[PDB]
Amino acid sequence: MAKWVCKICGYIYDEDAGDPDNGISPGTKFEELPDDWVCPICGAPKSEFEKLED
Ligand SMILES: [Fe+3]
């Protein structure tokens, strides 16, 4: 699945890994993340992520 980078800190949200420590099971697409999910490292909102795709 896709990977998205936090433009502030460089954390990669990997849809295959999810973010289970913050309530997100593996396989959750970035668009399916709750509106108040933030970067687990720096706290940036979803708006600050970019999909790693051409
Ligand atoms: Fe971040």
**Are 19 and 29 in contact, with CB atoms under 8 Å apart?**
no
- Pairing outcome for strands 49-51 and 12-14: unpaired
CA of 52 to the centre of ligand 1 (A): 15
Task: Report the separation in Å between the CA atom of 36 and the middle of ligand 1, taken as the mean of its atom positions.
Answer: 14
Amino acid occupying residue 46: K
In the chain, what are the domain boundaries? 1-54
* Tally of CA atoms within 13 A in the half-sphere of 31 that contains its CB: 3
> Which of left, alpha, beta for 45 (phi over 0: left; psi -120 to 50: alpha)?
beta
This structure's resolution (Å) is 1.1
**CATH class of the 1-54 domain in this structure:** mainly beta
Work out whether the CA dihedral 13, 32, 17, 51 comes out positive or negative.
negative
- Ordered DSSP codes for 22-45: GTB-TT--GGGS-TT-B-TTT--B
Determination technique used: X-ray
Give 24 Cα–ligand 1 centroid separation in angstroms. Answer: 16
**Binding-site entries:** 6, 9, 39, 42
